[PDB]
Design a binder for this molecule. Structure first.
Ligand code: NAG
Ligand code: NAG
Ligand code: NAG
Lengths: 49, 49
């Protein structure tokens, strides 16, 4: 309703949208119905130790 | 002709060969027809920067 998750199609198991749950292909002007949100990189938070 | 890419088998959508599109198993000794190239590591630019 407010947040976006990625889930398997046959069972609602919401997951945080990461760069390892998704793949990048193209630009943000060709997909009809695309939305804005943040893709969490699992590596940025821990590289700054 | 000069570069090496990895595509999906049914549609020509070339991508740069990285450590995300490929998996390692073995060495350059047993595979008949293996070709030298470079495998881009996404971790290096982010770690060096
Ligand atoms: C948000 O989406 C709009 C269109 O839906 C787009 O023009 C814009 O670049 C996106 N990102 C931001 C930060 O507004
Ligand atoms: C092969 O790789 C890319 C095609 O995306 C291009 O920069 C390069 O010039 C190509 N070389 C050819 C077609 O001989
Ligand atoms: C390039 O491939 C040849 C065989 O085709 C191999 O002998 C050589 O060691 C390879 N280059 C490197 C740097 O390993």
């Amino acid at each position: 309703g407010t947040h976006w998750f990625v889930t398997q199609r046959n069972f609602y198991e919401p997951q945080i949208i990461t760069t390892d749950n998704t793949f990048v292909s193209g630009n943000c002007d060709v997909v009809i119905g695309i939305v804005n949100n943040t893709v969490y990189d699992p590596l940025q938070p821990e590289l700054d130790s």
